[PDB]
Nucleic acid binder design. Sequence first.
RNA 1: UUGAACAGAGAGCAUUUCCGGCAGCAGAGAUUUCAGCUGUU
Lengths: 379, 515, 460, 182
Amino acid sequence: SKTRYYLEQCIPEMDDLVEKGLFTKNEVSLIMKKRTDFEHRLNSRGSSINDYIKYINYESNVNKLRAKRCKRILQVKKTNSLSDWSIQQRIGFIYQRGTNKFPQDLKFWAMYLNYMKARGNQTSYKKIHNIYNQLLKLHPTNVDIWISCAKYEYEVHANFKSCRNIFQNGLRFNPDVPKLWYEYVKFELNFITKLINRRKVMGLINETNPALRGDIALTIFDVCMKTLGKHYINKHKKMNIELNKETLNYLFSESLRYIKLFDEFLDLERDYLINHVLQFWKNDMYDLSLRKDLPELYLKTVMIDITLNIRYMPVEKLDIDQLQLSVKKYFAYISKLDSASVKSLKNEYRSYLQDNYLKKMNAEDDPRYKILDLIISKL
Amino acid sequence: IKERENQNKFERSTYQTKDKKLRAGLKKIDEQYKKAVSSAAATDYLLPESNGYLEPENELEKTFKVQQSEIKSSVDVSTANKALDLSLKEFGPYHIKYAKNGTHLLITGRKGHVASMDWRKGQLRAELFLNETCHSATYLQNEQYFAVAQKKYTFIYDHEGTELHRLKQHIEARHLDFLPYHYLLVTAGETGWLKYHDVSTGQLVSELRTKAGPTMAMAQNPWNAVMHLGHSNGTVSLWSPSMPEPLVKLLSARGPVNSIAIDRSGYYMATTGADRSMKIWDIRNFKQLHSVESLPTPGTNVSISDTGLLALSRGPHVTLWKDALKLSGDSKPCFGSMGGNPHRNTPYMSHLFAGNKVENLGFVPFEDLLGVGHQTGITNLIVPGAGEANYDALELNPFETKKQRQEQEVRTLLNKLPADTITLDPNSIGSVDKRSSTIRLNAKDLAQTTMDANNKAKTNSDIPDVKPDVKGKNSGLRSFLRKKTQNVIDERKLRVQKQLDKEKNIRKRNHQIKQ
Amino acid sequence: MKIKTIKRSADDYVPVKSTQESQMPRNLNPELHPFERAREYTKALNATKLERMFAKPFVGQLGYGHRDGVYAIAKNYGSLNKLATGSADGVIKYWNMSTREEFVSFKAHYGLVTGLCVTQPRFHDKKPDLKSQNFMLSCSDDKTVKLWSINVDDYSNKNNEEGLIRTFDGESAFQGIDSHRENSTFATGGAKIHLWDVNRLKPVSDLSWGADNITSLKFNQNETDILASTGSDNSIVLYDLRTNSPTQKIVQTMRTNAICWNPMEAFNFVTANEDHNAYYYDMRNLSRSLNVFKDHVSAVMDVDFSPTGDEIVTGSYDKSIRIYKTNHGHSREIYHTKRMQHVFQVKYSMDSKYIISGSDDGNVRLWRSKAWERSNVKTTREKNKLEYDEKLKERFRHMPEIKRISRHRHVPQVIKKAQEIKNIELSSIKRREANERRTRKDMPYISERKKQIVGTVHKY
Amino acid sequence: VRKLKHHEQKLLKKVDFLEWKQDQGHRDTQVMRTYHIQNREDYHKYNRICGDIRRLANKLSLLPPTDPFRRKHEQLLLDKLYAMGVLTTKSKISDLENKVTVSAICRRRLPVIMHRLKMAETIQDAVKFIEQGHVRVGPNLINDPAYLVTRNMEDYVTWVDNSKIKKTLLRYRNQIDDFDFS
RNA sequence: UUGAACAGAGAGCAUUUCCGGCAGCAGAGAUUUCAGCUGUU
């Protein structure tokens, strides 16, 4: 039977261990009794994934004991024999059998992947790719596995082509998940930032382009808005107008969180990216006017633009002319908006300018801070 | 193909070619044999248990001084409970038998009280009060059927205890046995006839006439299913159902042979006679190894365990020897070490059933236990090192279930071995006939042999050649003419007479020339 | 005093969970396992008896059969389940063996359908759709060779013409046909052997050895440029297309009916003979045969190899089919039926699992290549049990009653009486040869594999 | 034994653990169940006696038919067996081979006689009443169930006096006389 | 039928390339670990 075959496959390792001074024959017999129990539990009916986990833990501690015994007796870090890789091969085989039998246990899949990544020198990139291929075919609608695949390929191999292909296939399978779009934008921004800093490194060693601009991330942004809106409508499909307004509000939050990612990206042209996203939101969506449909969100976007005109610049090195231009834009927006909207926008702008400059610098310390306090009192 | 220490028991014995296909095929056969033997010996890492032992730490410590109470206190509770005592004062004495699994026990009193039980569970399968003289009982292929040798006829009962069969052909049997691969129930007794009965079909396979009076003892060789009978003339005879005469006759004792035991490997046999002599024989080579002479009292029973312990019961005593079956003279069983001589094999254990007489002995299979039947029932003695620790679940499973028993019954029935396959040597099936030619003869060689046989008459090679040097007293032609019938005259005898006359004339001429 | 006993924890032998199977401790010590030879012998004898119980070879017939006897059978070498049969009334059917029914039937010719083969035509101007359509060539005594297209439902890639594409017209009648395994060319027998092309309406070349007719053809499967042919003058002639010439000729005692090349060995072929035998031949040395297959009673009408090349199948005039291993000179199995009559075509399926036979009664039948085997997929335990049984039967085949059971077949009374008549006649020839060898001091001993050959054109 | 599968039965046609040819159909067990025979060897002792009768009848048949010795001995045997009660009639010679059975002898045992005499409702009841000391054949108490009753001896198979059974039947008919002890 | 450029697969074959010794530097990960660098063997 299968248990007998697997035990007879375990035999040559114990031949090697007895041949070296590492283990006594009785100790080998006790180890094989435990392995007999575990192999019977795996190959019988009524098994669980916990039996696989316990067997892997047992083999791991056997390997640790073997390492200590090889350090102590022979005074060598490792022998050149079968026994130093055979337990590792067995643990990989137990993981493979467990994933084949219960493919739905994502924790066991993660344990398999972590183990195969951890034994880096002995494993193969081909093996990690095969485990990813099996797992991605079995669970194509799990976004985290696609993200982990792309992350492994980006940090370990720095394979930007494979990372792009992984993200594109994953978004083909999961077009409704905002998280995968976000990670794709983050990867592309990381790639172009690394290209920019690599060009800068070259320019300092020795002696434009839409790729360096960020138009790839902008196109991913636009396709994200269309696809996420369409799939959100398909999931939740006068009342249609209310649903469209709710969809626009839902997309607005993801857009603002993309804005926060752009603000996190300091090296990139934040002003360019914010200009593009506010251009998109200035363009009408869902057959309704944005400002008329969501005046609170329109006022929020106007205040966001007015603040981010100078928010990229530090408060210590703030430009009085830029602050005056922002205040003039705020006054124009207040004139355009309703009186309650103008009052709310003025209060928000005053609070933002206060938290920017008034807490940072004193009116006695800076002569321009007195003018800022006067402008805040006027607002 | 690395060489291994335990390879010897996995080795198998066997009783320069120009052909390239044959050379490569024989090379493949030898390679596969060596690989299979090494890979079989490599599986001793997978043995789950180890045999028991009883070791003395000091020089003052003797193993035969160790008592059953001390052993029962020392060993674990399950084995202490397995050592069971049954007091049955009325219908004694009791002859005991164990199942080949060892999970069932079959006791038989002389006054007709026959019981089958699951001794470890404490569950009684059957209990019969026959009110009749009963001598022996045995289990059949399971615990489901058992045979009892009653006063005249032998009876077969099922698991619950109903009579299935009354075997009129088996008369006054005192000894019962079962061959578990041939499904043969073997009876011997007062009539001096050995009878083999097929329990599956119901046909009596063999009636053999021992011609030596009532059979005093009977054992089976588990290796080759040959029955060793012990007669009152002092000979053990070896019987096969396909032959009317015994295969081997061994002159073992002077008086009647009290008991016979054969070890599991079938290589050693122990007999006790009424002459107070216990003899250990090699079976395969048919020499005797040891002859312990003048026991204090004649040994009533011998038993041999699966590990190789030898148990001798003489009246109230039971003594066991360890490593007594070996070839060396240091392995001869003795009773006392004369001043602590290590070459003397003092008994491994001893026990006394005071005021009792041991009826029969049987080692519990795969347990460290020896069951003793006696005048008041049964006891189990704990004997560390007695039973085989590692069994095989395909052959005999002590933890067998009902459905596993049901499947194993049909499996063994399908693979029942025919009675004609029983030989002295189990490796005779598949061999070339002994009368047949050692080398293969093709058409050309057979035609050449036929031509030689035809030309032999013309070349006169049939008659012996004339030898003048050989005297006429011992001459082959003289013996040929003497062995031929006097009245009948044939051409061959005429040529033999002419050649004998010519050789006699030549010898006379040579003698005259010398003289 | 150290007292240690056998202690057995119940956890290692009785599982705690109900759902778990019981553990099987195993000890390979031979003392625990006696009677090796006798036990394996009894298993092998039970395997032979079980084979005799399970021997149920007849799978079934194809359709309703032809109106007249079946004289041409050609398998599709690309497709597993397709066949082409042609009868003596000029009717040709294409068969799906999976559903056991015909795709199409054609009233093809007016004479007997003398030859049939399945082709993959390769035209210069166009490429045929071989996924949707299959093609077959036929040749008859009405002096025609015709090409046919059949619609096939194996693939569903799409949502044409069934029938006559091109008619090749000849001067005399045609007796056999075969096609090239990698080219467009094909050859037809008859009065002269002609190499044709599907793109040309007249023969490309004439390959005839002298003025004798040619009955059957066969293209080599591996060395696809080699051809072999049978003549009515007891001759087997080889041909090579690279030299475009008839390579060698051998003359035997009687006329050979059919030829098949080994799929696995480019230089071996079997010929069916009127000797009641079949002969296995090496192309390089035709002075002797490799093997003689001797079990038939009347003339062997057709021969086919297994795709693995281990076995041949013969169909004869004694209304029987016989399967041979290439090693042994006698048959392994005989197939017969009261409804079966003279067998003129046997083919061996591309799976090597089935045998297709066409008979004089007009029926095409499917048989198992091995009668005791079954076509289900086996579990692991069943597959191991069957393999162990086969190896044990092979090991103990040499035993008397195992041989007695294994060689037993029910044979028709006519075939059995003819066997004993041939045995008596062979014994009479043996005593006459013994008397001749007694009379003559030095007589040559001629080999059984040499006896059938009258001569060869090119000496060795 | 579980039920054999189809391929197993063909290889195991002769296998049977419960019916053997030497059992002869369990005819002995059938007869003992019919007539409540307690001893196991009673059927075989009766069968040996029947075999002696049949062997003697066969020898008398092989004698010539118009033999005074043959006719006298056949009539002697017929009269003796009829007087015992084994043979119901004396008409035919052939009854000495056809109608001599073990069951014919077992029908002359005491419990079967009582059950036919309506003394007991079943043969088993008659057996128990015999062992319990209720039955006398003449003045003699018989506690052996195997005791064989002759045609003449049928007329004295009666209840013992002072029997609770006898008192019960007399009390049922309202004819109990306590002076007679009942 | 062949050539060239491109995109690959992990799926075959070969290696008489290098690495699974040691010392040291430095980085990163979860006090240890990890690969890498510089020497040496």
